[PDB]
Amino acid sequence: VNSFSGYLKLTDNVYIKNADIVEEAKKVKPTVVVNAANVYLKHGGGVAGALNKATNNAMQVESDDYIATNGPLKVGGSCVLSGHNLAKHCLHVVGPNVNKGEDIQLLKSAYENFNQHEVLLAPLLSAGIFGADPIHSLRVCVDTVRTNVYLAVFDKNLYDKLVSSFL
Ligand SMILES: O=C(O)CCn1cnc2ccccc21
């Protein structure tokens, strides 16, 4: 049993809810929250900007030190950093950004990072400001992630479309 409440069950391991991931993290304090990161860990907008704002910019300060030491992530890659006030850990995962021309086949590689963690609170990778087809992103999640993932969909309208269209 875990603390996640109000989710619709899509599969054995994937759950979904219309929720603000920031407000969900603050309530649950999950072991792992996933950030929709870029390779520079520049948390300007979208999910990343919202998570970072909720940490009072401490996520960005920590991230800048990580990049200064290690250099940029790979598209499809990840790193584990603090979850600050939101979670124990933040898994920063880089999905491909269609608005930068990145290979959508890298979305599966991105979701494979989730398999290193038994339970996660996450957004749909590569959706919204990154531009990828959201139904395709949920499909890749279901067909890639084997650990238990609780998806926070920000767009209510989108939430209802993801559920209604789910195969
Ligand atoms: O709803 C999500 O969580 C996914 C990212 N996203 C946010 N607003 C959106 C509006 C349209 C499509 C995706 C959108």
Tags for this model:
globular; 7 strands; 167 residues; binds 3-(1H-benzimidazol-1-yl)propanoic acid; 4-stranded mixed sheet; 3-stranded mixed sheet; alpha/beta
Question: Can you describe what's shown?
Answer:
There is one protein chain. Strand 6, helix 5 and strand 7 (148-153) form a beta-alpha-beta unit. The strands form 2 sheets. The chain has a 4-stranded mixed beta sheet, with helices on both faces. A 3-stranded mixed beta sheet has the order 3-5-4, with helices on one face. It has one domain. It is globular and about 45 Å long. Helix content is 35%, strand content 19%. It has helices at residues 21-28, 46-54, 58-70, 106-112, 134-144, 156-165; strands spanning 8-9, 14-18, 32-36, 78-82, 89-93, 119-122, 148-153. The protein has 167 residues and is α/β, with parallel strands linked by helices. The longest helix is centred in the middle third of the chain and has 13 residues, at 58-70.
